[PDB]
Design a binder for these strands. Structure first.
Lengths: 60, 49, 95, 125, 206, 149, 78, 108
RNA sequence: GUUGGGCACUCUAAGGUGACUGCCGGUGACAAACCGGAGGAAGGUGGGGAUGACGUCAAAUCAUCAUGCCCCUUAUGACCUGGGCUACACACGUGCUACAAUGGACAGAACAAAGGGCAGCGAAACCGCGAGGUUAAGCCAAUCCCACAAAUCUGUUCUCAGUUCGGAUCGCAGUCUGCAACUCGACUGCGUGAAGCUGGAAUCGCUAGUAAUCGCGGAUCAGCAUGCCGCGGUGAAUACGUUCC
């Protein structure tokens, strides 16, 4: 069950509280960041591949 | 305070010199002899007061 | 005429700052300079590992820094000069 | 109007030494009105006691940031800097006493997997 | 557990962003539009050997620059390539697209085209020594102070898969002013999936 | 590796001593010098009141009673567990005296550590006291094991 | 449910008021556990769906301030 | 003594009244504000007027056995009706909804 | 600091300069280097981060993804409601709160940093003991809001008890979020107040703005934080040494 669940999130449910955040590139909840609307590992991959214009390696 | 500190310190350094002499009797020749002589005389000097 | 540029790179924002600064300064508008305004930055800490290893993380950094430019005297020659400044997509002019 | 900046532990004080008798005025309040625990009051006075400056300048201080001992360090550092601006002479005395160092001991940044930038949670075998 | 990718490591030191704009209020929507763009363009021109795509966002306008290392497959007949490229993007994205196509002189220094050229040869069943050594000769004659190509997977040996390093010259991954091109590619063969990792120390910036 | 050294702050607004601020930094619970300074000055004011002396001299006299000449370290050779007597260098004499004052004061039990530390100083002055149990017992351990040095 | 009103589902309220407009009947198969017990429910043996079956419970004078799923534990233990 | 149970003579009034089953701190302060004892007296030192007011104020309030009998009625209520929360009351498992693979050591 | 005024000062964010054993003396082959000294905001990789070599454990991930091979297919696929992932006799890792006068409660005075806010942050006023409620200013934010920091300091009060310690658990009545808080949410109010009076064998963290302690913030998210990630506040004790693990 992957594309069915992605499709179910891409629907409009019965109630607004059934709406939950999801991947948009690599299908999974648990740690989809609201800002990027992206999964965590896919954020790490794309931010390594020079995309996602804000994030570089952090040090302070 | 003073006499007890002097007594215990002089006796511990005295046993240091004596054990250092008696562990090896013929080596690192003779500084231990002056050490034990001065320490024993100073122990008598401290106990005399 | 309170132009707030905000970008991710400081050098691109410097180019788009001094371009407005010079084009408005040359025609007498009494340009108060590129006032540097505090950056809003966000830190995203991420479990590096695919599956396990909560102790193994990696931190990413997004800095958006902004600078304020004010033009006080009207001088609409400067406004017609500002309207034709084509400066790139990095900086987000908002007058 | 001799002026000195003091920085300590994310606190910054602005010390202006006016010719007076020895009153220190922190944000329109006085010393024990704003700093209790008079070890900080005598320690905040150390640049004015090491070189003989005992009653020849009042001190006016504008402080912000940090906590009260951090503000104490910023005030005494700004005093030592403005008191160099008074006489450049006794820089050897202040420097042998410290007083131009700005202890850079900022509170350290927390690391991931640690509790408090050195703390490991607990190890069990 | 090993090395951080140097592409993601030198962003904001010397290597720029591919995707260059500033966020206004729909940053996520611009991101996922550009993911659909990059997927579509990498599918259509992963035959025509395009390495990298830089996207601008210019207030209803998008400047896409395309780095190919050959012009006349991508500018082509003049009309037809930029037409057939901009037309489906103007529809499936929803706004205006401008296309500027920069050509990479010295095609053997960009690690994406190098890793794809090694992957194709693995799909053409060229031996995994001939691919890497041939390509290392191509890069070291095209002029590079170091190249490292590492291929892993089932090499034609069934129940054990292992990694293979070949390299020439200095590839100093710890010097943070290095200008190293890193790139992955995949090669789906009958025995599974091979992974090509190429990174090219090309020269540093003072 | 090599030895590293430390520092400490010179005055106290009443009782201008180094070692009294050394006791202020001691007995600090959870980063509160304010509570330890209040406890300390109320205790030394009790020592100035209850015995008509300045509490500096009573406090140093108590220190002189507690500061141990001879620690006895360990030296395990084989299955022997020998203890070896060590002449304490006087920095550690002062710091073991301060630990024993602080620990046995708060270990006594009275209706403030003001009173507990004050009465522990008053006992270590007139040498019979709680930290001086540790002084006597360390000197007895060094006296029995003096054969090794 | 504080001052918005109490809560019941419209289908179970509909069925119970159909049951109360004439007379009582068999158990009411109701998947709703989330719904409070109104005092107009009293006497109605109703079948709460616990997760795998419909358990019949008979409602009294006391069983009002709670809900339906307090009267159907879902986990069997020893 | 007042509700059939003692209060200690040597405490203050606000907290000697706490030992009655049904009066904590804040109901004690609600009493002694109406009475006006100013919260600083022993209860070994009061007058019969000023303590009789304390007695009949506590007599108006639901304190000693009323509380026990009604809470026994509540426990018997959710024991008799069924009521999984009363199953938790009965069995020795936590009532308000609490995890039980760990501690839950007030109840067994 | 509201106005006018000023860029001095802090601050902010850009370009610099800046610390390199550079200079002195000593030791040491003359080297490399080391010890003390001077200057200096900074002294010997100044403090920290990011960076994790060849390889080891066929370590982990087919459940982020992609996947070779094998299997199911009107089902090992799909929808829907309901339950469960929160069970509970037990063990076991990590954590929170205490066992109390350096304490508890009450009142007064002050001091932060870092970060967030558009169908969002939400002032102020009013009501409610309180959780909160109604109307709503300003704010796409160095302005406005979150946001009244807390330990601290100073007074009042208790006086060493299973208590004016501690809050488990529990009854009743409430509040908010949201179709909906029964299993299974957080918070408040009243009442009840337990075990616990510093912990056996064993065992862990930390070398300085650290440990200890105190609050603050943000992700996630309608709502759920004692977890995590950062932030400041006060702020130590010790390092003789390499005998032992």
């Amino acid at each position: 069950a992957k594309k069915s669940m992605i499709a179910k999130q891409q629907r409009t449910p019965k109630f607004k509280v059934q709406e939950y955040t999801r991947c948009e590139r690599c299908g999974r909840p648990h740690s989809v960041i609201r800002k990027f609307k992206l999964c965590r590992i896919c954020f790490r991959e794309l931010a390594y591949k020079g995309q996602i214009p804000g994030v570089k390696k952090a040090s302070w | 305070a003073a006499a007890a500190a002097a007594a215990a310190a002089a006796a511990a350094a005295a046993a240091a010199a004596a054990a250092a002499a008696a562990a090896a009797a013929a080596a690192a020749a003779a500084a231990a002899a002056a050490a034990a002589a001065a320490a024993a005389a100073a122990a008598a000097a401290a106990a005399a007061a | 005429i309170r132009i707030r540029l905000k970008a991710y790179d400081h050098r691109i924002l410097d180019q788009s700052a001094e371009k407005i600064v010079e084009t408005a300064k040359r025609s007498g508008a009494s340009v108060s300079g590129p006032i540097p305004l505090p950056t809003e930055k966000s830190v995203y800490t991420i479990l590096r590992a695919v599956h396990k290893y909560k102790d193994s993380r990696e931190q990413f950094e997004m800095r958006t820094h902004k600078r304020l430019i004010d033009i006080v005297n009207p001088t609409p020659q400067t406004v017609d000069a500002l309207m034709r400044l084509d400066l790139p997509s990095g900086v987000d002019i908002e007058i | 109007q001799y002026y000195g900046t003091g920085r300590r532990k994310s606190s910054v004080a602005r010390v202006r030494l006016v010719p007076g008798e020895g009153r220190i005025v922190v944000n329109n309040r006085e010393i024990s009105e704003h700093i209790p625990s008079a070890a900080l009051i005598e320690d905040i006075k150390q640049p004015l006691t090491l070189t003989e400056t005992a009653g020849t300048y009042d001190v006016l201080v504008n402080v912000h940031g940090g906590g009260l001992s951090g503000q104490a360090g910023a005030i005494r550092h700004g005093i030592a800097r403005a008191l160099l601006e008074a006489d450049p002479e006794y820089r050897t005395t202040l420097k042998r006493a410290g007083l131009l160092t700005r202890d850079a001991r900022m509170k350290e940044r927390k690391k991931y997997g640690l509790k408090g930038a050195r703390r490991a949670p607990q190890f069990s075998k | 557990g090993q090395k951080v990718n140097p592409v993601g490591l030198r962003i904001g030191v010397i290597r720029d962003w591919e995707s260059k704009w500033y966020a206004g209020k729909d940053y996520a929507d611009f991101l996922h539009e550009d993911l659909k763009i990059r997927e579509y363009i990498s599918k259509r021109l992963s035959d025509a050997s395009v390495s990298k795509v830089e996207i601008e966002r210019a207030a209803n306008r998008v400047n896409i620059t395309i780095h190919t290392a050959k012009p006349g497959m991508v500018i082509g007949k003049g009309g037809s390539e930029v037409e057939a490229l901009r037309k489906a993007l103007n529809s499936l994205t929803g706004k205006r697209v401008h296309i500027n196509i920069l050509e990479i002189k010295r095609a053997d220094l960009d690690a994406q085209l190098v890793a794809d050229n090694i992957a194709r040869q693995l799909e053409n069943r060229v031996s995994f020594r001939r691919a890497q050594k041939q390509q290392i000769q191509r890069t070291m004659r095209a002029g590079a102070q170091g190249v490292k190509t590492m291929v892993s997977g089932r090499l034609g040996g069934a129940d054990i898969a292992r990694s293979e390093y070949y390299s020439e010259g200095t590839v100093p991954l710890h010097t943070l002013r290095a200008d190293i091109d890193y790139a992955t590619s995949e090669a789906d063969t009958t025995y599974g999936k091979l992974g090509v990792k190429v990174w090219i120390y090309r020269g540093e910036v003072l | 590796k090599g030895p590293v050294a430390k520092r400490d702050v010179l005055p106290d607004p009443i009782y201008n001593s180094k070692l009294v601020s050394r006791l202020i930094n001691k007995m600090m619970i959870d980063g509160k010098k304010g509570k330890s300074q209040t406890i300390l000055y109320k205790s030394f004011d009790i020592i100035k009141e209850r015995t008509g002396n300045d509490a500096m001299e009573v406090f140093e006299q108590a220190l002189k009673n507690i500061m141990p000449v001879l620690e006895v370290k360990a030296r395990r050779v084989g299955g022997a567990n020998y203890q070896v007597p060590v002449e304490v260098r006087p920095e550690r004499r002062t710091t073991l005296g301060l630990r024993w004052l602080v620990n046995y004061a708060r270990l006594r039990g009275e209706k403030t550590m003001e009173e507990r530390l004050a009465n522990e100083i008053l006992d270590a002055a007139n040498n019979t006291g709680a930290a001086v149990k540790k002084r006597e017992d360390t000197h007895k351990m060094a006296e029995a094991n003096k054969a090794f040095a | 449910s504080l001052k918005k009103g109490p809560f019941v589902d419209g289908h179970l309220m509909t069925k119970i008021e159909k049951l109360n407009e004439t007379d009582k009947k068999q158990v009411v198969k109701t998947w709703s556990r989330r719904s409070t017990i109104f005092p107009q429910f009293i006497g109605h043996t109703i079948a709460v769906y616990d997760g795998r079956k419909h358990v019949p419970v008979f409602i009294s004078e006391d069983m009002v301030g709670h809900k339906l799923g307090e009267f159907a534990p879902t986990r069997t233990y020893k | 003594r007042i509700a059939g149970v003692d209060i200690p003579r040597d405490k203050r009034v606000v907290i000697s009244l706490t030992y009655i089953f049904g009066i904590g701190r804040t109901t004690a302060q609600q009493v002694l504000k109406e009475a006006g004892v100013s919260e600083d007296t022993r209860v070994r030192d009061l007058t019969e007027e000023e303590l009789g007011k304390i007695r009949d104020i506590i007599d108006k309030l639901k304190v000693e056995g009323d509380l026990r009998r009604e809470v026994s009625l509540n426990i018997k209520r959710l024991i008799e009706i069924g009521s999984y929360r009363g199953i938790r009351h009965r069995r020795g498992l936590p009532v308000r909804g609490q995890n039980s693979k760990n501690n839950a050591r007030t109840r067994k």
